[PDB]
Design an enzyme around this catalytic site. Structure first.
Site, short mmCIF file in Angstrom:
data_model
loop_
_atom_site.label_atom_id
_atom_site.label_comp_id
_atom_site.label_asym_id
_atom_site.label_seq_id
_atom_site.Cartn_x
_atom_site.Cartn_y
_atom_site.Cartn_z
N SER D 74 0.98 -1.28 -0.11
CA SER D 74 0.07 -0.20 0.01
C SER D 74 0.89 1.22 0.01
CB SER D 74 -1.02 -0.04 1.31
OG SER D 74 -2.03 0.95 1.07
N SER D 79 -4.67 3.94 4.14
CA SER D 79 -5.81 3.57 3.04
C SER D 79 -6.19 2.21 2.78
CB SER D 79 -5.14 4.19 1.76
OG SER D 79 -4.11 3.15 1.55
N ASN D 177 -2.23 9.05 -15.45
CA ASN D 177 -2.84 10.04 -14.95
C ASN D 177 -3.37 10.96 -16.09
OD1 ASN D 177 -3.70 12.01 -12.21
ND2 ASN D 177 -3.16 13.09 -14.05
N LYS D 182 -8.83 8.94 -16.71
CA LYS D 182 -8.45 9.12 -15.33
C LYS D 182 -8.76 10.43 -14.75
CE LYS D 182 -5.87 8.59 -11.47
NZ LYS D 182 -5.52 9.48 -10.47
N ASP D 186 -11.64 10.05 -12.51
CA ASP D 186 -11.16 9.87 -11.23
C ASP D 186 -11.03 10.92 -10.37
OD1 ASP D 186 -8.85 9.53 -9.29
OD2 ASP D 186 -9.31 7.46 -9.71
N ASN D 187 -10.01 11.77 -10.60
CA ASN D 187 -10.04 13.10 -9.86
C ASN D 187 -11.14 13.81 -9.74
OD1 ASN D 187 -7.75 11.84 -11.34
ND2 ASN D 187 -6.28 13.42 -10.49
N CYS D 191 -13.69 12.19 -6.40
CA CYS D 191 -13.57 12.81 -4.96
C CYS D 191 -14.92 13.50 -4.88
CB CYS D 191 -12.41 13.70 -5.00
SG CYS D 191 -10.72 12.99 -5.40
N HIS D 297 -2.25 13.95 -2.19
CA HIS D 297 -1.81 12.75 -2.14
C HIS D 297 -0.76 12.60 -0.92
CE1 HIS D 297 -0.03 8.73 -3.16
NE2 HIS D 297 1.10 9.26 -3.14
N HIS D 349 -12.63 6.12 -3.48
CA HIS D 349 -13.64 6.16 -4.66
C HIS D 349 -14.27 4.81 -4.88
CE1 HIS D 349 -10.88 9.62 -6.68
NE2 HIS D 349 -11.18 9.75 -5.39
N1 LIG Z 1 -7.34 11.56 -2.51
C1 LIG Z 1 -7.67 10.98 -3.93
O1 LIG Z 1 -8.18 10.19 -4.13
C2 LIG Z 1 -6.91 11.67 -5.03
C3 LIG Z 1 -7.33 11.61 -6.26
C4 LIG Z 1 -6.74 12.38 -7.30
C5 LIG Z 1 -5.64 13.10 -6.86
N2 LIG Z 1 -5.26 13.11 -5.72
C6 LIG Z 1 -4.01 14.20 -5.33
O2 LIG Z 1 -4.67 15.31 -5.33
C7 LIG Z 1 -3.51 16.32 -5.25
C8 LIG Z 1 -3.92 17.10 -6.65
O3 LIG Z 1 -4.72 16.52 -7.53
P1 LIG Z 1 -5.26 17.71 -8.97
O4 LIG Z 1 -5.05 16.60 -10.02
O5 LIG Z 1 -6.20 18.19 -8.29
O6 LIG Z 1 -3.94 18.34 -9.60
P2 LIG Z 1 -4.23 19.80 -10.57
O7 LIG Z 1 -2.93 20.33 -10.42
O8 LIG Z 1 -5.49 19.61 -11.21
O9 LIG Z 1 -4.95 20.91 -9.25
C9 LIG Z 1 -4.13 21.50 -8.37
C10 LIG Z 1 -4.48 22.82 -8.09
O10 LIG Z 1 -3.87 23.13 -6.71
C11 LIG Z 1 -3.36 24.51 -7.28
N3 LIG Z 1 -2.41 25.07 -6.35
C12 LIG Z 1 -1.10 24.69 -6.08
N4 LIG Z 1 -0.51 25.17 -4.93
C13 LIG Z 1 -1.55 25.92 -4.66
C14 LIG Z 1 -1.57 27.07 -3.59
N5 LIG Z 1 -0.54 26.92 -2.80
N6 LIG Z 1 -2.93 27.59 -2.84
C15 LIG Z 1 -4.08 27.27 -3.80
N7 LIG Z 1 -3.92 26.51 -4.93
C16 LIG Z 1 -2.82 25.87 -5.15
C17 LIG Z 1 -2.83 24.37 -8.81
O11 LIG Z 1 -2.90 25.79 -9.18
C18 LIG Z 1 -3.86 23.26 -9.40
O12 LIG Z 1 -4.91 24.03 -10.10
C19 LIG Z 1 -2.35 15.58 -5.91
O13 LIG Z 1 -1.66 15.50 -4.80
C20 LIG Z 1 -2.89 14.35 -6.22
O14 LIG Z 1 -2.18 13.33 -6.27
C21 LIG Z 1 -5.79 12.52 -4.88
N1 LIG Z 2 -10.93 3.33 -3.60
C1 LIG Z 2 -9.51 3.36 -4.12
N2 LIG Z 2 -8.79 2.26 -4.65
C2 LIG Z 2 -7.50 2.51 -5.24
N3 LIG Z 2 -7.04 3.77 -5.50
C3 LIG Z 2 -7.81 4.68 -5.25
C4 LIG Z 2 -9.27 4.73 -4.62
N4 LIG Z 2 -9.74 5.81 -4.52
C5 LIG Z 2 -8.81 6.86 -4.94
N5 LIG Z 2 -7.63 6.16 -5.52
C6 LIG Z 2 -6.45 6.79 -6.13
O1 LIG Z 2 -5.70 7.32 -5.18
C7 LIG Z 2 -4.77 8.24 -5.77
C8 LIG Z 2 -4.49 9.21 -4.77
O2 LIG Z 2 -3.15 8.84 -4.00
C9 LIG Z 2 -5.59 8.86 -6.87
O3 LIG Z 2 -4.74 8.46 -8.20
C10 LIG Z 2 -6.79 7.78 -7.25
O4 LIG Z 2 -7.23 7.35 -8.32
#
Ligand SMILES: NC(=O)c1ccc[n+]([C@@H]2O[C@H](COP(=O)([O-])OP(=O)(O)OC[C@H]3O[C@@H](n4cnc5c(N)ncnc54)[C@H](O)[C@@H]3O)[C@@H](O)[C@H]2O)c1
Ligand SMILES: Nc1ncnc2c1ncn2[C@@H]1O[C@H](CO)[C@@H](O)[C@H]1O
Ligand SMILES: NC(=O)c1ccc[n+]([C@@H]2O[C@H](COP(=O)([O-])OP(=O)(O)OC[C@H]3O[C@@H](n4cnc5c(N)ncnc54)[C@H](O)[C@@H]3O)[C@@H](O)[C@H]2O)c1
Ligand SMILES: NC(=O)c1ccc[n+]([C@@H]2O[C@H](COP(=O)([O-])OP(=O)(O)OC[C@H]3O[C@@H](n4cnc5c(N)ncnc54)[C@H](O)[C@@H]3O)[C@@H](O)[C@H]2O)c1
Ligand SMILES: NC(=O)c1ccc[n+]([C@@H]2O[C@H](COP(=O)([O-])OP(=O)(O)OC[C@H]3O[C@@H](n4cnc5c(N)ncnc54)[C@H](O)[C@@H]3O)[C@@H](O)[C@H]2O)c1
Ligand SMILES: Nc1ncnc2c1ncn2[C@@H]1O[C@H](CO)[C@@H](O)[C@H]1O
Ligand SMILES: Nc1ncnc2c1ncn2[C@@H]1O[C@H](CO)[C@@H](O)[C@H]1O
Ligand SMILES: Nc1ncnc2c1ncn2[C@@H]1O[C@H](CO)[C@@H](O)[C@H]1O
EC number: 3.13.2.1
Lengths: 428, 430, 430, 428
Positions: D74, D79, D177, D182, D186-187, D191, D297, D349
């Site tokens: 993992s 997670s 990505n 994706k 996904d993103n 979320c 992330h 997700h």
């Molecule tokens: N939790 C999940 O399941 C999941 C899913 C997808 C992506 N992510 C993570 O989420 C984070 C962003 O993903 P994204 O695809 O949204 O990236 P993205 O680049 O589309 O959007 C990120 C935004 O943050 C803005 N930003 C950067 N620094 C900033 C600041 N100091 N103040 C305000 N805004 C700021 C950038 O301008 C950009 O628009 C990454 O770490 C990615 O891995 C998590």
């Molecule tokens: N349920 C899930 N299982 C596996 N990966 C996931 C899940 N939900 C979100 N993610 C992935 O976790 C990453 C964030 O680190 C993103 O790329 C997203 O696609």
């Protein structure tokens, strides 16, 4: 011939609208603020072929503030706004456009815009590429004289790509449509406001409770669907791209084909930029007083020729509003004769979103005339830093307070704080 | 002597007739009413004077009352709300109408008075909107009151007045609160405005809504529609309110809720819907951003201080009919719409005909109820039965192609409820 | 003899106490009530038996009644809705509670009966939800009725029952319809469900909502919230309904409105909210898509035919507590949630505490009204005054940082209205 | 060591969830339907480092159906879903993950996944690039053995671009990505559903009436904002990119800085992928019981270290839920200790959107092992036709009826009817 308009007596009213428009177009006003004393476009004679409207008037004037001769025609035969064409004519700028042109009168207007007092044109500013295709087909002798061209709309750049591919595009061009600032605002947020305006002014029909069918779910389709959803229509999307089709499904829109949708659609809106979207077999199945219209660039999406030849009767309700009766007794209301409805039945997009498109256009004209080196014969994009500049110039008006990276954060992200914050392939 | 009518231009009749035909197709409520009563002619011998916005929708309503056997004479209830071609069509049909777009406050009172007397005698029924005609008669023609069988009142302001008149013992004619019919207050006021406000603003100014801050005063049914409409087009809506309940609703829906004293510094667009006086004042105007748009959609033009603008502005430029652009001593400019009159009808065509069909079906029903069942209604302010209310809604389900569920006998019995009568208790708020 | 309480695990008291503290910060309505009445102790000498979902929110309500000087004994009103740690905290405080998650239909009736008698005698006040406790007493303990001062009923089903009982002359205790308080029916029922339904479904199944077709039966206040919530997450919502008015609303809002007989072929997700029997039947199940999720959020589990599933299914696999996966002869599978019981409390924690504060403030007020003003309330079914209703809303404006406008004396006088008393007429529907 | 999990007794319950998950992941099921008898991945030993969840379990199994050894760890320390890690362990696949790992135990799990029974790994399947950076820094001797790598998340591909730039990325990689399928689902849509789930399960707080502050308005920020808006929160966006910032303004969100927003935010959600977003000076100004969390992330966006050192008291409410009291008497509720909340406080997700990401991942693994020619040492994208294929494989489940171009229409548009319908730069 110094110009051609419907009425120069409207220039006064026209000037009022411009003064108001200016206040809604900061992006264009910064350009004046920044290049008035500089006159970069000094030497340029820019033959324009865009919708001659209040918004375009401000664009034209900006181009002049940067020091450049300009002659203008309209690209659609009903988009022009009389009083706006008047205020530009009264300012001493050759404009050839009015609201109600025929096909011959349309072609006639583009021709006046080709030759200036001091020689032929050296810059094109097109949308759809009518002025581009004309100069390539009718006046190829003038092509070596032209230094650059900038294209506004999606159909005209797809056409500029088809020309470069077939090796017939002899002049360098900048794709202004595919600026994020244009495509992801103009096409999106613009139509989201002006579609319904066009429909309302024409019909004054209730959106709520109705079933609306939107062919296509690209940037334009997205805006139109969102708008109609807003007023409580039930929206059905048709689409050929599985990605676009899936986007619509994940937003809660039923996605089927026109063959199905025509049997329940109260309102129809083609946005494909493609032919043969709505045919007679669709018409025959539609509910009574179904409202059909188009917001794509060319009037090729609806089979109006079929309605003329097959309808029992055609009652005209008012300009750009026909009500056909069919052999099945039910009636169809067609708008703008199939031509784009937001400019044919309303005033097009509001000035603010156009400021984004036209601010791109100024930079696209500057670049092609100030740095003729960077851009060889091809189809190029504007650099992201300039695309971000356009966005930045509009933040003030909207009262947006933007965050700035600390040096520590910039280093973490590995990017320059002024520097474009997204990779080229970023899709926003 | 006495004119047959008075309208802008009878030439616009042919055009209006087309609009009427289209509208008819959008107003099943009124059409079913015709198909149902044209033979029985329930309103025979009724002499109905109406004071209501002379639009395409109202034309269809007028002709429905005639088909039901009534004699009708009409004036508009707002100096800016008439649609000339709609008036022409009615006039050409032979119906005494007195209305045109652009009336003076003088002409407006004149227009009403032309309706009070018919060839067959004085009026005996009132179809009012805002209470202007009700108040006029009770004041300048009280001798006419005993020969009036009843009143139906269309809008919130009007019925408020009626209730006040009832509480002060000065209302002498029995009236039906049509506004507080569910099929009116929850559709016309809400959904109607949700579509017509934006349209009024667009026609008047052609301004981008997206990215603007918008301030809506009042969060009753009208304000709810407006807020919804504005936010839909990408504006950040701010709300003001005096009722803590309405205020709670707005917050729960994600709207910032504060005072006009605060909002006037943020707003790009201002929309009054309170139905109350002195909502926007000079102190507010002086803090507004450059080219702030200001408009009202409440019933009376008492919500915005226009006279302040006129007296205190340094510049005033008419941009076009019902669009004025002031400049204040601070150099910033204020766009006013329709001299502060309601902007949906002032700068556009008002509500779409489909929702007005609900409003106007309730009106026709109230007129039949008062004319043919006087004894049901003693001097007071009354509601239509819930049964008739539900009937209105049912009449518009077909056109939308809604398929309604029917209770089984068990289900009904379980719910202790008729299969075919009010599915809700009186106090139900939908 | 008699137990002090009975709960899952008293060990979960410490944990529950933390939850109570957090909840208290989210429920200003109840806290103001405490700050206002802890010294006066208005409910002194009241012996309140309550039948209401023993959750974190209810705990806060219970402790508020105690602070107001009352003696309280509680049972849950649903066999699946108790939150064990919330029951532990109350039990450890010294309050006789009889509730745990996973009760048998037998144990559930036992739990209620433990509340009917206090050390100081029998109950004299009822705080009911659904009418179970009301019906129990009127039936198995009618001799106890004369010593009961009043009843407050929380939910729509309960008050319907009350009105029926009143119409058949069998209700012997005066009651307050708390459900039809505006601050309850338009917030709890609407906004509460809008958040808790999705949460119930998610916890139970973890399914993507976006891209699904969802079928919501009923478009009253509960259904409105559910439809809204589902459509928000990108589902295409379809609606069924028997009231043409409610149906018109749904259409006007852009929902397809048809019959369950039709929808069962389209739905991926099914949500009953009608409060009526036999909404989903075997004939419906047999046409559903593979892995259709089916759940109810109406008060009683009579809306879905679960016994049909049990008898006619070829497979039944418990996925986890309150999540069963059937297979039918056609080979397609049906996911059922919480054995057809209400899914927001069954598979999740119900409404968030903030909106419940509105529900429960109205409850406390009704209890004070019945206990201390018996003479106001004769045997019947009564509403709280609009003044107290508006007071509830006003108590929650602060936490949301809402700034309410005050009428000027002129504005008020113009509106003919107190600056500080019902800003709306009774029939107003918000 | 054959594996490592929290409980193998959960494998039974785990198997149930998978069977249900499978029905929600058509995209992955087509791959099994199509490559079972083919076993393209025959020879491949794929060391995975993704969140070990029900969704991932189905991915792993799919990879095996295509004939490939797989060991899994993992990538986040909270997670993992125990019962899902159990069902994969019980299936005879070395998985090293559980819900509650320490930092040392986290690094320890990735190490077991490097060596198989028949030699070291030859394929990486990473997200964030921990397994990529580990093998590059600790085990560079194994880099020549590895044939390809595929990266899931935005931070891990931005890191894969920084490596190729500094010439340290020695192995060819595919950016999964930046597949439309994706990033724009996904993103975005993922979320939008799982953020609020995480928050609700942790706090059970009312969203309606609250002010929510969302740092960042990229794909993740967009989804989070839309979700909270849905439940009637008032949403405030902070942002550094003017384009993203303007998008938010045109959607009716107030856009200001954290310095302003912290004084009214009830709920806080960092989505930047950047450091130092929420600091102590923000905390000091927040309203009582403000709820702070992160869905980026890495847990670098919130200054939790500050809360520990400066808080008066830290009460634990339950796992991944702390309630700090500050010297100003007001309290802050922090979730998942700053780590991503949707997987730390919920189930991540839903399976359907993951099917889109993981279907991309299968193709990304096939391509890197079946056609090692096309992809030299760099950072490459999947071809649009394959990106569209993923979308197409999910249409069936959603009951989407897609339109097909006539030959006449295809010729008008100048595109092959099967052919990708959009240019490379198209942004959807
Ligand atoms: N939790 C999940 O399941 C999941 C899913 C997808 C992506 N992510 C993570 O989420 C984070 C962003 O993903 P994204 O695809 O949204 O990236 P993205 O680049 O589309 O959007 C990120 C935004 O943050 C803005 N930003 C950067 N620094 C900033 C600041 N100091 N103040 C305000 N805004 C700021 C950038 O301008 C950009 O628009 C990454 O770490 C990615 O891995 C998590
Ligand atoms: N349920 C899930 N299982 C596996 N990966 C996931 C899940 N939900 C979100 N993610 C992935 O976790 C990453 C964030 O680190 C993103 O790329 C997203 O696609
Ligand atoms: N009226 C205006 O003010 C305005 C503004 C911008 C663009 N446009 C015009 O609108 C049209 C499209 O603009 P876009 O930017 O939306 O292009 P776009 O390519 O983003 O979206 C067009 C969509 O149509 C879909 N499509 C093509 N053929 C189809 C068919 N037969 N059935 C269903 N869907 C089909 C494509 O898959 C694509 O997704 C062009 O003609 C463009 O010039 C008009
Ligand atoms: N233009 C149209 O087509 C149209 C349609 C329907 C109703 N109306 C008119 O709109 C007005 C209201 O209609 P409604 O049905 O919304 O009635 P309503 O009474 O529900 O709305 C009144 C709202 O205004 C609030 N309010 C009163 N004074 C206020 C103040 N000083 N500041 C802020 N909020 C204040 C009240 O508390 C209430 O929430 C009436 O004049 C009615 O006639 C116009
Ligand atoms: N789970 C919770 O937390 C919660 C919260 C509030 C209310 N409730 C319960 O939810 C149910 C309804 O609550 P409401 O407040 O929405 O009451 P309501 O009476 O407004 O909703 C009833 C709706 O169901 C419709 N209906 C009745 N029979 C129908 C049928 N056979 N098919 C379709 N529609 C039908 C009615 O016409 C009406 O529109 C009641 O049982 C109430 O106790 C539960
Ligand atoms: N009001 C307007 N003035 C000028 N061009 C416009 C206006 N509204 C839309 N357009 C442009 O029209 C083109 C469609 O042919 C689009 O590129 C769009 O940007
Ligand atoms: N198109 C229209 N025709 C007639 N009355 C209308 C129209 N649109 C809105 N109204 C009415 O105007 C009143 C406001 O003064 C409301 O009662 C509303 O029903
Ligand atoms: N968290 C909760 N605690 C107590 N009662 C609740 C909760 N959530 C919903 N309810 C109530 O459950 C009833 C439905 O049976 C409704 O009256 C509603 O107010």
């Amino acid at each position: 011939l110094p110009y051609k308009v419907a009425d120069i007596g409207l220039a006064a009213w026209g000037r009022k609208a411009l003064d108001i428009a200016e206040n809604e177009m900061p992006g264009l006003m910064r350009m004046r603020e920044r290049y008035s004393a500089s006159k970069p476009l000094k030497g340029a004679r820019i033959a324009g072929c865009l919708h001659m409207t209040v918004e375009t008037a401000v664009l034209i004037e900006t181009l002049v503030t940067l020091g450049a001769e300009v002659q203008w025609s309209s690209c659609n035969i009903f988009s022009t706004q009389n009083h706006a064409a008047a205020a530009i004519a009264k300012a001493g700028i050759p404009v050839y456009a009015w609201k109600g042109e025929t096909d011959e009168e349309y072609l006639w207007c583009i021709e006046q815009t080709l030759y200036f007092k001091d020689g032929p044109l050296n810059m094109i500013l097109d949308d759809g590429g009518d002025l581009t295709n004309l100069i390539h087909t009718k006046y190829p002798q003038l092509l070596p004289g032209i230094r650059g061209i900038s294209e506004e709309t999606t159909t005209g750049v797809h056409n500029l790509y088809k020309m470069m591919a077939n090796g017939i595009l002899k002049v360098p061009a900048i794709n202004v449509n595919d600026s994020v600032t244009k495509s992801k605002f103009d096409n999106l947020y613009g139509c989201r406001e002006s579609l319904i305006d066009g429909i309302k002014r024409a019909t004054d029909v209730m959106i709520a409770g109705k079933v609306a069918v939107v062919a296509g779910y690209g940037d334009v389709g997205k805006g139109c669907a969102q708008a109609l959803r807003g007023f409580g229509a039930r929206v059905i999307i048709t689409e050929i791209d599985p990605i676009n089709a899936l986007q619509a499904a994940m937003e809660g829109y039923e996605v089927t084909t026109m063959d199905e949708a025509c049997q329940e659609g109260n309102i129809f809106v083609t946005t494909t930029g493609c032919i043969d979207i709505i045919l007679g077999r669709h018409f025959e199945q539609m509910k009574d007083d179904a409202i059909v219209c188009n917001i794509g660039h060319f009037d090729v999406e609806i089979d109006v020729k079929w309605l003329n030849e097959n309808a029992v009767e055609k009652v005209n309700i008012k300009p750009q509003v026909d009500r056909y009766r069919l052999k099945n007794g039910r009636r169809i209301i067609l708008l703008a004769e199939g031509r784009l409805v937001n400019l044919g039945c309303a005033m097009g997009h509001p000035s603010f979103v156009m400021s984004n498109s036209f601010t791109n256009q100024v930079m696209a004209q500057i670049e092609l005339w100030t740095h003729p080196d960077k851009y060889p014969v091809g189809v190029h994009f504007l650099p992201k830093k300039l695309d971000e500049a356009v966005a930045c110039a509009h933040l003030g008006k909207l009262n947006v307070k933007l965050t700035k990276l600390t040096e520590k954060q910039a280093q973490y992200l590995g990017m320059s704080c002024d520097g474009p914050f997204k990779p080229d392939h970023y899709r926003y």
